[PDB]
Chains A and B, each alone.
Chain A
Amino acid sequence: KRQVASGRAYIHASYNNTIVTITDPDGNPITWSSGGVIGYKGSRKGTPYAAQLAALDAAKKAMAYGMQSVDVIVRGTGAGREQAIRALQASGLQVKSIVDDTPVPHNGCRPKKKFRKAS
């Protein structure tokens, strides 16, 4: 019970799962959801439809706190990123801006063998 009425929306989309965290303008979260919060258990979390369900569930949880306008922030190249974008875009929540903030390093750490042949 905070009555935020305006906040931010972080979308962490990976090839294995999409997870949405709805926070306040200072970054402190309020509610959240993911593919595991919905009944999907295994690989079905890395699905665009599961990402849509997670986005809509986080949005409805944010409606309880009486929030109207959001600022969307995208991190990670994963299936279902744009689907969660379109889910939050028309969900009763007003989307004020979409920003991709995927953390790209400057060739700092050595990746796993799965991600090698690069630096």
Chain B
Amino acid sequence: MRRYEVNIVLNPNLDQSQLALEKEIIQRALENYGARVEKVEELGLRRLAYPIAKDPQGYFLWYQVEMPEDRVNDLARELRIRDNVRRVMVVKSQEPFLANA
């Protein structure tokens, strides 16, 4: 049971119904792997620095979670199956390192 952070970049061209279905599948897969959610930050569509999937923008999602480590990798694969989901990055949570303090 460690604390992780999930970054999900998906298609910015989705309407509200398809986006709701994508997020429903995300929540369902998180429940299926026992990932308690501590907080969420939905930043919406943003301008990428380079085109991803031939699209110059991307819709961002961020989830600070806590889950068993042994299936973390096994969870990430499940999130990459959806064609609308084009970027998935899971990172172990770390305390912030402040500079110029």
A and B touch in the complex (CB under 8 A): no
B residues whose Cβ falls under 8 Å from a Cβ of A = none
Binding site for B on A (CB under 8 A): none
